[PDB]
Amino acid sequence: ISPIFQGGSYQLNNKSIDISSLLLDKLSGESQTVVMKFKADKPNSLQALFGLSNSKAGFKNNYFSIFMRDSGEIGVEIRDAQKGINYLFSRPASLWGKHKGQAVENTLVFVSDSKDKTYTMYVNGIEVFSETVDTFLPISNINGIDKATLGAVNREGKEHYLAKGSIDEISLFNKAISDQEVSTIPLSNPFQLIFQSGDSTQANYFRIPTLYTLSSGRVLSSIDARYGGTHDSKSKINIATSYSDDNGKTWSEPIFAMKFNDYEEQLVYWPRDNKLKNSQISGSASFIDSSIVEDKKSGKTILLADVMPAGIGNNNANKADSGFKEINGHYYLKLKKNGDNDFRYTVRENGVVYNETTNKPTNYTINDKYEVLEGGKSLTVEQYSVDFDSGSLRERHNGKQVPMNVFYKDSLFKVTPTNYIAMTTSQNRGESWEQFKLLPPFLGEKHNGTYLCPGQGLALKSSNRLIFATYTSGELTYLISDDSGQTWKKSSASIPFKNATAEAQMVELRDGVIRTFFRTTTGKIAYMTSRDSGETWSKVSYIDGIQQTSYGTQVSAIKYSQLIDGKEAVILSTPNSRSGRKGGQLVVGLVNKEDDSIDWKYHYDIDLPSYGYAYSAITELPNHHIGVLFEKYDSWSRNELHLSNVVQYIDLEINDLT
Numbered sequence: 335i336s337p338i339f340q341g342g343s344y345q346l347n348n349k350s351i352d353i354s355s356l357l358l359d360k361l362s363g364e365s366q367t368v369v370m371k372f373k374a375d376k377p378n379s380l381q382a383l384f385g386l387s388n389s390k391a392g393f394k395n396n397y398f399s400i401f402m403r404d405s406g407e408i409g410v411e412i413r414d415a416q417k418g419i420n421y422l423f424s425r426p427a428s429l430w431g432k433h434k435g436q437a438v439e440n441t442l443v444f445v446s447d448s449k450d451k452t453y454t455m456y457v458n459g460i461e462v463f464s465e466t467v468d469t470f471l472p473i474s475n476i477n478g479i480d481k482a483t484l485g486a487v488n489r490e491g492k493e494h495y496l497a498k499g500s501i502d503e504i505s506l507f508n509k510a511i512s513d514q515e516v517s518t519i520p521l522s523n524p525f526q527l528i529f530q531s532g533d534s535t536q537a538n539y540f541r542i543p544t545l546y547t548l549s550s551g552r553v554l555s556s557i558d559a560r561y562g563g564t565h566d567s568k569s570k571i572n573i574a575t576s577y578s579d580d581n582g583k584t585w586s587e588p589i590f591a592m593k594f595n596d597y598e599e600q601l602v603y604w605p606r607d608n609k610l611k612n613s614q615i616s617g618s619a620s621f622i623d624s625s626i627v628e629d630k631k632s633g634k635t636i637l638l639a640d641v642m643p644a645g646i647g648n649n650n651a652n653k654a655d656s657g658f659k660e661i662n663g664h665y666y667l668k669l670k671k672n673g674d675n676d677f678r679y680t681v682r683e684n685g686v687v688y689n690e691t692t693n694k695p696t697n698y699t700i701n702d703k704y705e706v707l708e709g710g711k712s713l714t715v716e717q718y719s720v721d722f723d724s725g726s727l728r729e730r731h732n733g734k735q736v737p738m739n740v741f742y743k744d745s746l747f748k749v750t751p752t753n754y755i756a757m758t759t760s761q762n763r764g765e766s767w768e769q770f771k772l773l774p775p776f777l778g779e780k781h782n783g784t785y786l787c788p789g790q791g792l793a794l795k796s797s798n799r800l801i802f803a804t805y806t807s808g809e810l811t812y813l814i815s816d817d818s819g820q821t822w823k824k825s826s827a828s829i830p831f832k833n834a835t836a837e838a839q840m841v842e843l844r845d846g847v848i849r850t851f852f853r854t855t856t857g858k859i860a861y862m863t864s865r866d867s868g869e870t871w872s873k874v875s876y877i878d879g880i881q882q883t884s885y886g887t888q889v890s891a892i893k894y895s896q897l898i899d900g901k902e903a904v905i906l907s908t909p910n911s912r913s914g915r916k917g918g919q920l921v922v923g924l925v926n927k928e929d930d931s932i933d934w935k936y937h938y939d940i941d942l943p944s945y946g947y948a949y950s951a952i953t954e955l956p957n958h959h960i961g962v963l964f965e966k967y968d969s970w971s972r973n974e975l976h977l978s979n980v981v982q983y984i985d986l987e988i989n990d991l992t
């Protein structure tokens with residue numbers, strides 16, 4: 335079905351374009367679709383792209399607008415004072431500005447549907463809001479509309495919300511086009527999605543991306559599949575993975591590397607209003623923060639993640655307890671039974687549940703999947719589902735039985751409410767994953783477990799050594815295996831911080847020489863160096879030339895395989911900003927062989943300084959391109975919680991960076 339208006343190549347240079355004569359008399363009926371392809375690489379703070387207004391005296395609040403902010407937020411207003419209606423729908427972090435130095439053509443589709451009383455906005459193929467109202471307001475039914483305007487809104491004869499940008503194509507339809515028809519509108523996206531809302535994970539949200547290039551050429555990604563909005567644990571979160579066999583061009587349907595069944599995997603639209611946005615799934619077990627490494631010797635892929643029992647996160651995790659008991663220099667997982675006040679059980683060899691008060695064993699065993707068996711028979715619990723039908727979050731039994739797991743709220747036997755580290759392996763490069771195994775405590779019986787640094791582990795090039803960085807109060811705790819992840823030992827490296835989220839990632843500068851880059855609380859990224867393949871660690875130094883916030887952000891890092899400007903090169907990915915998680919950059923550093931110092935020579939801006947960029951994952955693709963999977967939004971900001979499809983993937987070449 336044809337547009338009632340089609341126009342193109344409009345330059346918005348702080349001067350509105352009047353299209354009233356062309357458009358206004360064409361508008362008919364109560365349903366409309368706006369399709370617009372536009373660039374804005376230097377937007378004003380708040381600017382309107384399109385406006386339909388009553389421009390007369392006394393009617394300044396009678397207008398429809400499509401607007402954007404220099405934060406990347408997109409929205410509309412639909413206002414009519416006579417009707418007492420002032421609608422505003424918007425979503426932060428919905429836009430691109432630039433990619434490889436060039437302004438990005440954003441594709442916006444806005445649907446105003448009088449029959450369903452629903453307003454829906456898509457940007458770049460992503461639905462960013464869909465809102466139904468009791469009292470519908472057709473956009474051309476605003477009392478006294480007499481102006482159609484590009485690049486401003488005409489109110490009382492003046493240009494409000496002047497825009498800087500361009501509208502390369504704009505079309506209007508006297509129909510609410512279907513979601514199907516929307517899907518056929520061609521896009522000019524600079525990015526792709528690996529994980530996305532409605533995929534096999536059925537999580538509506540994703541955080542904490544990782545990337546790793548396997549020896550076969552397959553590129554593997556892992557991620558937090560986050561169900562209860564974007565909240566850290568406590569929530570329901572699983573760890574999902576996807577891989578690409580064609581240098582990141584296409585990606586497999588995700589599968590789970592680590593998951594719990596105590597709560598249903600539900601695709602939920604988590605409330606974003608101030609009253610409810612802190613609603614949190616409070617009774618589910620969860621995983622959080624994954625990291626991947628490949629072992630050259632066995633060929634296995636190893637993935638670790640933090641594990642949280644039901645109701646548990648970092649804020650309420652039992653510090654002062656590892657969750658294990660030491661009996662002979664061996665560690666056993668503690669368990670508490672229904673009705674006891676203390677943990678009077680342990681899980682011994684082969685999974686036998688022992689009673690500790692009487693050193694007498696039980697008729698209960700824990701299988702490989704941490705599920706409870708009584709006399710070899712699988713115990714079950716009823717699953718929970720969540721909903722907001724009542725006007726607040728509700729967590730309730732759904733009639734389905736699932737194996738009873740010791741990390742569950744409803745389990746007969748429960749682990750200590752603290753954080754653990756789990757490991758799984760894959761023998762087929764991410765096509766399937768084993769059942770996870772808990773790592774032992776490394777800092778003692780009465781120390782809670784360390785926190786995994788999300789991203790990559792390190793496989794040393796000249797040995798079989800595998801390292802996963804973790805952090806805790808006062809130190810980085812490196813976990814080291816020389817036997818394909820069968821056994822681990824720790825290597826502690828003190829840092830001058832108490833209670834820092836010291837997320838750390840490593841690069842091997844040359845054989846046996848590791849530089850670790852890490853998040854701090856100082857506004858600068860720190861580093862330390864090992865020259866004995868991780869046995870001992872230097873004092874902490876700081877990078878100048880990159881700014882982070884006081885609270886910091888995860889940083890990703892790789893050793894590039896090729897020389898640049900004749901030198902060994904390292905590439906860092908991080909926001910570069912002392913204000914928020916925005917201004918994403920890749921920073922190319924050249925190693926000085928004299929002293930292993932790094933000269934941070936090239937800074938590549940991923941997108942606008944004002945556009946969001948948070949946790950990130952970088953990998954050198956088999957073709958020597960650079961793959962970047964990153965949170966394209968401010969994942970700290972309390973205004974940008976619970977956004978869908980903001981973790982995105984781009985492909986870059988080194989010449990783009992320099």
Ligand SMILES: COc1cccc(CNCCS(=O)(=O)O)c1
Binds near residue numbers: 622623640753835970
């Ligand atoms: C709250 O429970 C946690 C369990 C493991 C790790 C973490 C750290 N997540 C920090 C992310 S952010 O707030 O800096 O975006 C949190």
